[PDB]
Design a protein around this ligand. Structure first.
Ligand SMILES: Cc1cc2nc3c(=O)[nH]c(=O)nc-3n(C[C@H](O)[C@H](O)[C@H](O)COP(=O)(O)O)c2cc1C
Ligand SMILES: Cc1cc2nc3c(=O)[nH]c(=O)nc-3n(C[C@H](O)[C@H](O)[C@H](O)COP(=O)(O)O)c2cc1C
Ligand SMILES: Cc1cc2nc3c(=O)[nH]c(=O)nc-3n(C[C@H](O)[C@H](O)[C@H](O)COP(=O)(O)O)c2cc1C
Ligand SMILES: Cc1cc2nc3c(=O)[nH]c(=O)nc-3n(C[C@H](O)[C@H](O)[C@H](O)COP(=O)(O)O)c2cc1C
Lengths: 350, 350, 350, 350
């Protein structure tokens, strides 16, 4: 009896993590309708597989912003990984490098850019918020650039934090020996401070502002309507991440897989569109690409596997998804990502 | 571990109220299909949120019939609140005044207009039925006007009472020290009398009749078809309340959120259209306004919180809904009620 | 704590009847999908009630084939009622007479036409099958005419019996002191004989044949497609009963409420169309009439209430449905059956 | 208390087979969504039965590739039947001969073509894979032809094996005294070898290749899109089997009953189209033929009944389906397979 699927790592995390920690990571907003729907919506898309195609050699490699990677599955920024495992972000960085894929570090990481860069080479993105204290935004950016990060993933769906009721009932707090390391050694305990820096005044001009302090590509994260996707194209974003923040912000927003297509269309092929939210199977990954995503990101499975198995756990999550994705490409008759078409899928709404 | 949502107050009420009292308040008509659907239909409406909008200052204030209030969440008339808590309607009136919103007192209240007016200033509406004994209707109206009530909410969906089977099995009766106080000190034990006064002969001309005995605005409560909404416009109603009476009348009528739009359209912007039935979240409130409601009313949560926590409980219900509604406005990109549009929502039936 | 709804009688029957007897009556065909759907399909139809209509006086009286009855709820032919209660069909006949409605006696009754006619006056219909031995068909008809039956309800959906698996597992047999009384005292133990008489060769010409041996009106029972309804009009049926035989024949036929309209349309107002299958509430009854039925029939509730309460039980089933139907008419704004329109309902499929 | 339906045999198999064996046979791919849907999709198709048609004599006989059989229900190739019962494929062959229907032997059978041919006469098909070692493909074909097999059923949906997670957790292995007998006595322990022979390079030209080494008709098994059905017509297949391999390959492919029609249309009446996947009732069989199948195949019920009852079990599965199919034809008004039309069914998607 073995661990055969990703979703199984969640069950194990849950039996061993303290309730407050598990809930923190697992929880969605309020009644968690979108949490559930993020997963459920993938079951409303079916396959239209082609048979008798030579599928000896499958090429999953892709190029993301000029960076060539091993597969179109990247890691989404989550937060305080050291609550899940001692090595926390170090383990996640070593597994992402090992897999030939990209990691997106959280500005709320319990590891700083430099300590993450000290694990070894590997393409890494840094997630950020346009904080109130703009001098602070510039030091994080500089520090990110220095440590060798290749792009900035700007969260644009959080003017304010959504209500995740378990945290309130669990009276959630960051454990004793941990710190938000990117906020230490710069010119400003920290949890509260960082929570207060979230600027609820941001507008499109603030994204323009960010482009004057950095030369790195900017990916607006949290776009789910065609209206905002076009504005992101306009204000010169390097790509859009169709996300609902793992369903932790506003409830009742659509499943990202359902909003995907509308956003992909609005972008008009100008920039790469990615997705995250509920991706757990190689089949999920295929559907997203057939719909138009240039790649997908995974969040919760990483923290869950980390908690269960340390670095071996994240290594395993990544191996399982590329294996399952390669078999799905084989069985659908696709020899490259370029071969995946809209016709290989049939959506409930078609 | 704390109370984070409104719906939780129902569970607590239920564990402490006598079965007969709980059932009385909780029950719907016959198989209670609409009871359930009143809640469930809100989950068939999704959001289309706008991002990167300055949401520093949210204005939830609205004007209802020339009365400016703090938010578009008002209290619906329920009945015999003193079965739930000693202070019963006094507690509900003090919490509504404190919140800057309107209370709708039931003609079946266990507190009279004057005793409710003795708690302090505050805008209040009075619910009534065109009783058989028309002399009685006039004394209630006069007494209401005197006590300072600003409008009459006329129930028009009850020619006869719907069958709520639990009451029959529980052999429901009003507890000993309580009375229907509005029916005492006027020119006519009381429960039976009041039950017999419900006139099953009422027609549109009876609404005209009511306008000859009062100068206060009349809101027809219980309109769910476009046909009746237009007749209400005609017979000079000051606004319509799309209601199904908390699903206690006829079963299998649509969820009020589903009938809302048809009624809003028929009214052609001439008069304000409100809604009640199943509103439990700030998200619910947003959907109703995006559909066209000028405001919403809450019924059961008030009695449930009253039973659990007295006046602090109702205070809490109101604070939770305005908090949750303000965050929903922030996350959808709306700085005023005027900014809420039809485009910020996507209904299953669109 | 009291019995408030019809469906409750089933639960009580079940706790007291021997498993074999309960199963016999309760069971549907094979996986019993249509059994369930017969009930479930009524929940896919909603109301569009009119308010403020004088509903002082409700007239539920209707005329069925020149016979004026108290309400549009009649009793369907079931079978061997004496397995459920000693008085069996005598009790059902006295309750139907008392209620001012029509009873349809089964040719499989454990009581004969004359013994049913000996309970008192009352309009009664007789259900039959065109048996193999045509001489037998003529004696039943004659005997029916003699005993004062007003019409023949001809089952046309049973060339062969459907598979009701519980009967097979229960090794079902008619209890010792009972007999199929209509098959005794005529020119032909009986259960087997009667089971063998079912003619699987019947065609439309056999219905013509029946009209040469009787002058009584013929109602073809078991029509669910528009094709067969038109043929029934042609071959001079006095009315059609949209039935699926209580879902005991072929599984996966539609719920009668779903097939109703197609049949009502095909009949083009030429003859009365009735319905049976899953009718348990006054609300059910309203929907059927709004769709076009001239009346409905109830089967299982009668045997269940009989088993629970004898004649008082059937009396109660009938009182509960007319009460619930009158309140539904009041709440929908209908003062006569003629006032019930298609516009007072909204079907999922509209 | 008796066994009345096929599905019941699964429950009994499960209580007596070792977990590893049961799981092997029962399992679907990954989350087994299509497994479930293979069954569930039959419930979305309803009947439109004709009444009063002489249904004395029902003719279920059909002709499949010039071979006249007793009914349109054949047996699908499964694998290693001797894990389920000692007699394994011998028992299945004797029951198929006895029933007057066709058996499809698996190339993974625990019995060889000749030993299956030694049970007696009977029409038999042989399932195969275009193995890597093409010399091996030719010996199996020759051996099949010799033993008297009439057609080849070529699996075309398995370039690679789908992930059936229970097998991995159960560490599945073929029991000690069994062997893949068709792979012994030819020019090449065996399980591993045979697993490695599956050629993931196959294309349409490989099907052309097969036609140069055999004169027997070729039925491409595993076609579910209209695109591939037309290519199969082109490359001269003798018929197509709409299959999803019992849902064990790729998950999220449609239920075969849902893909059926699209494939039947694409074939343009040129060649016979068959179906398998989830067929458990005589009603299932009718729906497939009304949709256009020339016949259906059953897989799992055979192994389950084998495990429960040996040869008597398979005999019983076949008798139950023809009985149930004949009654469904009687009740729908069909006297021959030719009489089954598209109009006798109404699909959810129509
Ligand atoms: C604990 C946690 C913290 C997160 N913090 C952020 C954040 O600060 N900014 C952001 O844009 N997304 C944040 N996310 C969302 C992820 O970046 C990603 O959108 C989501 O987790 C993907 O969905 P999934 O877990 O179903 O894979 C967070 C997610 C988790 C679980
Ligand atoms: C115990 C109780 C008594 C009520 N009495 C009346 C009434 O006399 N007249 C009326 O129009 N509505 C009455 N209502 C309905 C409310 O005014 C309102 O329509 C409904 O409660 C709102 O639905 P909700 O509880 O899901 O918030 C009553 C509701 C309850 C729970
Ligand atoms: C035990 C039993 C026997 C029945 N026998 C017949 C029959 O011989 N002929 C017939 O047309 N219908 C027969 N029916 C069906 C009823 O006449 C009627 O169609 C069905 O019971 C109505 O559905 P309901 O029980 O949900 O009210 C029988 C029903 C039951 C329960
Ligand atoms: C244990 C097992 C092994 C099978 N092996 C094969 C195979 O080697 N090739 C193939 O085309 N189908 C194979 N099938 C699928 C069957 O031929 C058929 O498509 C499927 O079992 C029919 O679905 P059902 O079991 O719901 O009747 C296998 C099925 C089972 C259960």
């Amino acid at each position: 009896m073995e661990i055969t699927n990703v979703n199984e790592y969640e069950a194990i995390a849950k039996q061993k993590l303290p309730k407050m920690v598990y809930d923190y990571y697992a929880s969605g907003a309020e009644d968690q309708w979108t949490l559930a729907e993020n997963r459920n919506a993938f079951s409303r898309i079916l396959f239209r597989p082609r048979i008798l195609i030579d599928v000896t050699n499958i090429d999953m490699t892709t190029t993301i912003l000029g960076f060539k990677i091993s597969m179109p599955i990247m890691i989404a920024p989550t937060a305080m990984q050291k609550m899940a495992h001692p090595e926390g972000e170090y383990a996640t960085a070593r597994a992402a490098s090992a897999a030939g894929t990209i990691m997106t570090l959280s500005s709320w990481a319990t590891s700083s850019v430099e300590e993450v860069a000290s694990t070894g080479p590997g393409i890494r993105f840094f997630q950020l918020y346009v904080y109130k204290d703009r001098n602070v935004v510039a030091q994080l950016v500089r520090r990110a650039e220095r440590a060798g990060f290749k792009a900035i993933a700007l969260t644009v769906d959080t003017p304010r934090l959504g209500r995740r009721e378990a945290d309130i009932k669990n009276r959630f707090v960051l454990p004793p020996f941990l710190t938000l390391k990117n906020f230490e050694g710069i010119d400003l305990g920290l949890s509260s401070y960082v929570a207060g820096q979230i600027d609820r005044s941001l507008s499109w001009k603030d994204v323009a502002w960010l482009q004057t302090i950095t030369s790195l590509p900017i990916l607006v994260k949290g776009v789910i309507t065609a209206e905002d996707a076009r504005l992101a194209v306009q204000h010169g974003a390097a790509g859009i991440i169709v996300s609902n923040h793992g369903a932790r912000q506003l409830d009742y927003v659509p499943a990202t897989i359902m909003a995907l297509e509308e956003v992909v269309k609005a972008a008009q092929g100008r920039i790469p569109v990615f997705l995250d939210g509920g991706v757990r199977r190689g089949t999920d990954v295929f559907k997203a690409l057939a719909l138009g995503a240039a790649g997908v990101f995974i969040g919760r499975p990483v923290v869950f596997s980390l908690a269960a198995e340390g670095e071996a756990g994240v290594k395993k999550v990544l191996q399982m998804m590329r294996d399952e994705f390669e078999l799905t490409m084989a069985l659908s008759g696709c020899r490259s990502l370029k071969e995946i078409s809209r016709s290989h899928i049939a959506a409930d709404w078609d």
